């Protein structure tokens, strides 16, 4: 069948990938007691947008549920799926003649049918007529709450939909659950996004020089990803934190826009991941700006390397993800004590939630169509009300087919450290004489993308990780490393 491809050495993605997602969704819905015969799933694609009130077009990126079901790159579409038969119909915009002048060829419906390997193609303005002719029992539309943003998914609507029976409660948890479990075809794409982003991270490590602006490496990363990988988008805004900025978890946004000059002695924390055909990657590399770890940098870095590898070694089906977070916390505390930053009983440190001072974010999250992927907190799964753990984006147990980021880190964040020092329950663990040395250090984060398998995990990411490997890469020796 047909494939999405951007030529050169980019990945051919079979449109069969999306056909399989539609089949899986129907199979799940048919087993749902709330679903009656003759139901039709109705999804609305994203539309073109502009900057504010201007005619400056914003580059269109498809809505993630719609992409998952159809793989369609054009704005203004709808898509429906007959649950009982699996029959898929794509609705495409009926374009004005002038489109041919300004935007390009006005493709036929048959062109789109062949391109996307759907069963039928119709024009958007015909959706009420076409659905009326099929005499559905109920239309199943998308509405639910994203547990990372708090936003409500946009339910499909069209002229005449009020004449149909519409249910907007059934679909969301079911299509979310399908997205949680990646197919082998989806894993092929995520292997590829990790391949290209890993290569780009290695090029950045080779290119980094003291005196550069952070954004020079953002630019280089995205250029590798696009020109070599066909990744027109990143999965999220690049985080290129040097020096103290490496303690800022989502550094690089408009308010802190990767605009610091990299200094000798700084640590760098570069959290970047290209997106290919709306599939994510998320990789974080930490390294010394000048290519040589100091003793202090090595100690903090290897503490996080230890927790990274311990978690990857422990992950397998049945493991409760919050237990992996607590494992990372315990290892960070052990290593911070071994460094002289902390002293006393590590058991007592754990009981006092001291780990969250140094890692105030969740250990990792689902990854897929969205970098913070859906389904972390389905009904019944509760957020843990403790420091650090409350920021986990899932409290689920691991099962084969899930894709997770594993992103432990240690940071020196002044207001968190100062809170701890003001707190009798935590203050005694801290050795200020040693800690003062790490004020303004920033932090280290080491992030891998992995698949949960029957036997453990498959590591997708391929970047240098030991001190020796990283120093070699920065010296231009990027291939001299061996993944976990």
Q: Where on the chain is the footprint of ligand OH (CB under 6 A)?
A: 271, 282, 284, 407, 447
Q: How many residues bind its own copies (CB under 8 A)?
A: 76
Residues 176-205 that bind its own copies (CB under 8 A): 203
Q: What is the C-alpha separation between 141 and 175, in angstroms, rounded?
A: 11
Binding site for ligand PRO (CB under 6 A): 249-250, 361-362, 365, 393, 407
Cβ closest to ligand OH, residue 82 vs residue 447: 447
CB 342 within 8 A of CB 412: no
Measured CA to CA, the distance from residue 234 to residue 282 in angstroms comes to: 9
Residue reference for tokens 């004005």? 96
Q: How far is the CB of 170 from its own copies (least distance, A)?
A: 17
CA angle 463, 185, 188 (to 5 degrees): 15
Q: Which of 27, 126, 259, 468 binds its own copies (CB under 8 A)?
A: 259
Member of 74, 334, 423, 458 binding its own copies (CB under 8 A)? 74
Rounded Cα gap, residues 366 and 383, in angstroms: 15
Question: Contacting Na ion (CB under 5 A), which of 78, 158, 277, 377?
Answer: 277
Site for its own copies in 380-439 (CB under 8 A): 413-416
| 78 lies in the binding site for Na ion (CB under 5 A) | no
Minimum CB distance to its own copies, residue 50 (Å) = 6
On the 0-12 / 13-18 / 19+ scale of CB atoms within 10 A, 333 is buried
The reply to whether 271 sits near its own copies by the rule CB under 8 A is: no
Nearer to Na ion (CB atom), residue 57 or residue 440: 57
Using CB atoms, what's the residue nearest to ligand OH? Answer: 271
Count of beta carbons in the 10 Å neighbourhood of residue 123: 14
Q: Binding to its own copies by residue 53, rule CB under 8 A?
A: yes
* Tokens 């707190």 -> residue: 423
Least separation in angstroms between residue 160's CB and Mn ion is 40
The token pair at 308 is 């990274």
Closest CA to 406 of 481, 306, 475: 306
* Nearest C-alpha neighbor of 418 from the set 434, 439, 437, 444: 439
Which of 246, 236, 431, 438 shows the shortest CA–CA distance to 342?
431
Which of its own copies, Na ion, ligand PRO, none does residue 18 bind to, with CB < 5 to 8 Å depending on kind?
Answer: none
Q: Which does 437 bind (CB under 5 to 8 A by kind): Na ion, Mn ion, ligand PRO, none?
A: none
Residues 371, 433: Cα–Cα separation, whole Å: 40
In angstroms, rounded to a whole number, what is the distance separating the alpha carbons of residues 209 and 291?
A: 9
Which CB, 143 or 309, lies closer to its own copies?
A: 143
Give the one entry of Na ion, ligand OH, its own copies, none that residue 255 binds, where binding means its C-beta sits below a cut-off of 5 to 8 angstroms depending on kind: its own copies
For Na ion, the binding residues (CB under 5 A) are 206, 232, 276-277, 474
- Site for Mn ion, rule CB under 5 A: 271, 282
């Amino acid at each position: 069948g047909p494939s999405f491809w951007l030529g050169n050495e980019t990945l051919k993605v079979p449109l069969a990938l999306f056909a399989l997602n539609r089949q899986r969704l129907c199979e799940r819905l048919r087993k749902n007691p709330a679903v009656q015969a003759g139901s039709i799933v109705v999804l609305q694609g994203g539309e073109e947008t502009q900057r504010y009130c201007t005619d400056t077009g914003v580059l269109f990126r498809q809505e993630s549920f719609f992409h998952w079901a159809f793989g369609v790159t054009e704005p203004g579409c709808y898509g429906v799926i007959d649950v009982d038969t699996g029959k898929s119909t794509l609705f495409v915009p009926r374009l004005p003649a002038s489109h041919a002048t300004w935007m390009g060829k006005i493709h036929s419906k048959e062109h789109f049918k062949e391109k996307y390997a759907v069963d039928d193609v119709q024009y958007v303005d015909e959706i009420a007529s076409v659905l009326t002719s099929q005499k559905p029992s109920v239309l199943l539309t998308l509405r639910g709450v994203n547990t990372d943003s708090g936003s409500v998914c946009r339910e499909a609507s069209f002229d005449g939909i009020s004449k149909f029976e519409v249910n907007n409660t059934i679909l969301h948890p079911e299509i979310v659950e399908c997205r949680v479990f990646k197919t082998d075809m989806e894993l092929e794409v995520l292997r590829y996004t990790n391949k290209i982003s890993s290569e780009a991270h290695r090029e950045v490590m080779k290119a980094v020089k003291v005196g550069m602006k952070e954004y020079e490496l953002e630019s280089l990363f995205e250029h590798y990803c696009y020109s070599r990988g066909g990744m027109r988008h990143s999965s999220y805004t690049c985080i290129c934190g040097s020096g103290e900025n490496s303690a800022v978890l989502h550094y690089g946004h408009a308010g802190a826009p990767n605009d610091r000059t990299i200094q000798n002695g700084d640590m760098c924390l570069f959290d970047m991941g290209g997106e290919y055909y709306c599939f994510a990657s998320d990789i974080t590399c930490s390294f010394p700006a000048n290519g040589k770890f100091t003793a202090d940098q090595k100690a903090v870095y290897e503490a996080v390397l230890r927790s990274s590898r311990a978690v990857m070694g422990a992950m397998k089906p049945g493991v409760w993800w919050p237990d992996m977070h607590r494992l990372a916390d315990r290892i960070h505390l052990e290593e911070l004590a071994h460094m002289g930053i902390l002293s006393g009983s590590v058991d007592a440190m754990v009981q006092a939630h001291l780990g969250a001072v140094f890692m105030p974010h969740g250990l990792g999250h689902f990854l897929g169509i969205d970098v913070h992927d859906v389904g972390g907190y389905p009904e019944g799964v509760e957020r843990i009300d403790e420091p650090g753990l409350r920021s986990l984006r899932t409290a689920r147990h691991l099962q084969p087919g899930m894709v997770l980021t594993v992103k432990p880190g240690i940071y020196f964040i002044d207001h968190l450290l100062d809170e701890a020092l003001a707190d009798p329950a935590r203050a005694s663990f801290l050795n200020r004489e040693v800690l003062q040395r790490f004020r303004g250090f920033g932090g280290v984060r080491i992030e891998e993308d992995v698949v949960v398998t029957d036997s453990g995990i498959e590591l997708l990411t391929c970047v240098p990780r030991t001190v020796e490997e990283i120093e070699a890469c920065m010296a231009g020796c990027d291939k001299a490393f061996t993944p976990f």
